A and B are shown apart, each in its own frame.
With several copies, the nearest count.
Chain A
Amino acid sequence: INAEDPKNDFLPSFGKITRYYAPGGPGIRMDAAMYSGYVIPPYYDSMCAKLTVWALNWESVVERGRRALNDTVVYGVKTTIPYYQEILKHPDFRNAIFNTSFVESHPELANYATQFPRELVAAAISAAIAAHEG
């Protein structure tokens, strides 16, 4: 779980992590650098945490992967989570046959739906309240 932005040729996304809720429940292990409020220094690598998922088999794991990635909630900095969800979605991967070329051989993986930030929705609402009150 690197603090980079895959949309922008994986450019680093250093800065402050405003909110962080750690993933949990079964099959889930976290090994984190980061925490709530942590400010990622720019002199080192981008890795804020390693998320490590486990299940009794291939199908289950992948599902649990997808889950745990969402389960990991991180505001303030662009992360590779969304990108990973694309990988886990893609059938060649689920099918469990792949080699070093898989990423290169599938650039589409970075062209994904970037869900609109809850930090922006709150502003849009607050502006509706401002225009409604005076």
Chain B
Amino acid sequence: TEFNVTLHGETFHIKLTGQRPFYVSVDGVTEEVVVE
């Protein structure tokens, strides 16, 4: 869950929670995602 994603020169600290929607924290900034 507590990932570090290095994409294209940058790294991003990710922390997930949970057609149904995750809530997701990018560098301590949480918002709703939906996958389908």
Contacts and interface: CB of A to CB of B under 8 A. Distances in A.
Interface residues of B, number: 14
A114 to B, nearest CB: 12
A121 B35 contact: no
A121 B33 CA distance: 12
Given A116-B10, A132-B16, A124 B5 contact: yes
A127 B26 CA distance: 13
Given A131-B3, A132-B1, A132-B16, A125 B10 contact: no
A132 B2 CA distance: 10
A123 B12 CA distance: 11
Contacts of B10: 116, 120
Q: Is the interface of A mostly helix, strand, loop or mixed?
A: helix
A128 B16 contact: yes
Interface residues on A, range: 10 to 19
Interface of B: 1, 3, 5, 7-8, 10, 12, 14, 16, 22, 24, 26, 33, 35
24 contacts: A116-B10, A120-B7, A121-B12, A123-B7, A124-B5, A124-B7, A124-B12, A124-B26, A125-B14, A125-B24, A125-B26, A125-B33, A127-B3, A127-B5, A127-B7, A128-B3, A128-B16, A128-B24, A129-B16, A129-B22, A129-B35, A132-B1, A132-B3, A132-B16
